[PDB]
Design a protein that fits this description.
- With 611 residues, this protein is α/β, with parallel strands linked by helices.
- The protein has three domains: 226 residues, Phosphoenolpyruvate Carboxykinase, domain 1; 108 residues, Phosphoenolpyruvate Carboxykinase, domain 2; 268 residues, Phosphoenolpyruvate Carboxykinase, domain 3 (Alpha-Beta Complex).
- The protein contains 16 helices and 30 strands.
- α11 crosses α16.
- It is globular.
- It starts with 13 loop residues before the first strand and ends with a helix.
- It binds guanosine-5'-diphosphate, manganese (II) ion (MN) (4 copies) and sodium ion (NA).
- The site of one manganese (II) ion has 3 residues, from loops.
- The PDB classes it as lyase.
- The entry lists the keywords kinase, gluconeogenesis, lyase.
- It forms a monomeric assembly.
Amino acid sequence: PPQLHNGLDFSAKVIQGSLDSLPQEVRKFVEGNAQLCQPEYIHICDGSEEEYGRLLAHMQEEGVIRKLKKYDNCWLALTDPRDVARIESKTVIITQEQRDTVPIPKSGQSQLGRWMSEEDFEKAFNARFPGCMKGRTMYVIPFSMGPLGSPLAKIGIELTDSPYVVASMRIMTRMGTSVLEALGDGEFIKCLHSVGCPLPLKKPLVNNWACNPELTLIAHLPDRREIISFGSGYGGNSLLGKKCFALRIASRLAKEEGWLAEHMLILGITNPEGKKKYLAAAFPSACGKTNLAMMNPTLPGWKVECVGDDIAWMKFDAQGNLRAINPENGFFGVAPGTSVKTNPNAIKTIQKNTIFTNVAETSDGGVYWEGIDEPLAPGVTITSWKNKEWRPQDEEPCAHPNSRFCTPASQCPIIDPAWESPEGVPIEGIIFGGRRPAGVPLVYEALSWQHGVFVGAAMRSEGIMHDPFAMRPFFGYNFGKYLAHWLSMAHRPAAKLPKIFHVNWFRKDKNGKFLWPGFGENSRVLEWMFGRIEGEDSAKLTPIGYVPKEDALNLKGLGDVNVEELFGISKEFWEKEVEEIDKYLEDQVNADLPYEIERELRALKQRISQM
Ligand SMILES: Nc1nc2c(ncn2[C@@H]2O[C@H](COP(=O)(O)OP(=O)(O)O)[C@@H](O)[C@H]2O)c(=O)[nH]1
Ligand SMILES: [Mn+2]
Ligand SMILES: [Mn+2]
Ligand SMILES: [Mn+2]
Ligand SMILES: [Mn+2]
Ligand code: NA
C-alpha cells in the first residue's frame, strides 16, 4: 500500500500473529480501527490454551482478577460498582427511519427498543473512539457464533482493549485461528469495543476495573453489519456475541433471510421408551429459565439434556423441520439463586475453568452467593463482591444480584450429544413462560400457529411488565414486523410448525405460597407436552387453549395437588387480562400490529365473553 511517510501500516505494533495473514477485509477493519483508536499494540488472538493461561496470569499479576484456590482453574473479577450490568438506556439501534427499528407508541417512549439517528450516532462516535485505546493492547478476536463451519453459523471479529473480554469470549464463543481459516474472504460482523479509558488515565481507576460510565454507549448498525460499544467492560455490553450479535443483529438478518433468532433455551427430552424430542423455550427474567435447560427430572425413565440455555437460531430445513442451534459456546449465568440443592447440573458445570464476576469469596478460596443453599463449615468466612468482610446478618447481599459465572458449555453434565451438530436439532415444540402469581394455569397449549404467536406477544416477565417473546430488550427491528415475520412462517409450504405452549411455574395460592413444586417436577409438564406433540387425546379445550384433562398429568408422589385451582380459569380474571393486552398492543404496537394478532385478540375476547 502507497504511503508518503509511514502512518498507514501498523505491522510494527503487532505482538502476536500477522496482519499479512489476515483476510483482506479483516485487515482493513483492524488497521482502520488501529488508526482511529491508537492502541500501543495489536494482538491477534489464536484461541490457544497457552494464550489464555498467560493472559489470565497477567490479569492476576495486575490485580484485575484473583485465582480461586479451592477449584481447578477458576477466577474472580470484582468490578467498579458503576459497571455491573448490561445497560438498556445506553443501548441503541441506528437505522435511516426510526419506525424500522421500533413502532411509534401512541404516547411516551417505546418500551420495545431505543432508536438513534445516524447523525446523532456519528457525533457520539466522534466524541468517544478517537485515541481511546492509547497505551493499551488492541486484541483481535475472530469468533464463530455456532459450531465452526455450520451452515447456520455466523462469524464476527471483535476488537477490544479488555483482556477480560478476550478470556470471556474464549469461553462464550468459538474463537481463534481456526475461525479466521474458516472465514476466508467471507462476510463477518464488525464488532468494536473499548473500555474508553485511554492511558494516561484521566480519572481514578476503581477496583482495577476500567470503564467509562458517563460515556457508555452500545450501538448496533444492522445495515452496516457493525456493533460498536464504548465504556462498559461488562457482560452484555462488552461480550459482543451474546446479545448484540446473537439477538439484535441476528434478528434483523433472520428477518432479511427467512429464519429466527430468539431468546430461547433448547433442550432434548427422552421418554421411557427412548423416544427423543427437542423443545425451545423463551422465558423472561425471574420466570424459571435457568431451572429448565438443566433440569434434573423427577419422573423415572425421563431424561433431559441441554443444547443451550439462552439463545436459539432456528431455520426450516429442506424437509420443513425447524432446525435450531445454540450459537454460544458457554454459559453466562446469573450466580445468585444457583442452588447446590436445587440446580445440581449448573453447580457441576462451574466447578472448573470458570470465570466468576462479582460473587463472594470464601476464606478457603471458594465462591459464595445468596441462594447457594450450601452451609459453610464453622470457621469459614466470607468476603463480599465489594471486597468487605461479610456476615449472613448483614444488610447488603454478599454477591451483586447480577453477578455471573462464565463457563464452558461442554462441561455441563447433561449437555446434549447434538449440542454442536452443524445441521441443528429438530424443534417440535416452543414454550413461552412467565412469573404469574394469579389467573394463569400451570400449562396451556395454543389453538393454532397464529394463536401461539399471539400468546408469545402477550407474555409478561412478572406480575405487570410486558416482555413479548422474552425479547423486549433485544428486538433488532420493529416488533410489529417481527410479529409479521413469525406469522409468515405459517405460509412456508411443508413447514412443520412446532406446537406452542405457555407455562406458569409461579402461580401462588391465597397466601403467597406456590401452588406447584416446580423444578424437577416440571418433568411432569414436559411429559404432557411430549404426548400432545405425539397427538395424544390428553387435552381439554378451554377459552384460553387446551389444558391437561382430568387425570392426564402424572401426579404420583406429589401427594395432594390442588388441580382445580392450579388449572382454574376465571372469567373475571380473563376479561381484565384481554383488556390489558388490547391496551398494551394499541399503545406500543398500534399501526404496526398484524391483522392476525388483532384477530386473535378479538377471538379470545369473544371466547371469554361466552363464559
Ligand atoms: N415455585 C417455583 N419457583 C421457581 C421454579 N423455577 C424457578 N423458580 C424460582 O423463581 C426465580 C427465578 O428462577 P430462574 O430459574 O432463575 O429464572 P430465570 O431468571 O428466568 O432464569 C428463582 O428464585 C427460582 O428459584 C419453579 O418451577 N417453581
Ligand atoms: Mn439463562
Ligand atoms: Mn438472556
Ligand atoms: Mn442463565
Ligand atoms: Mn396468515
Ligand atoms: Na477488580
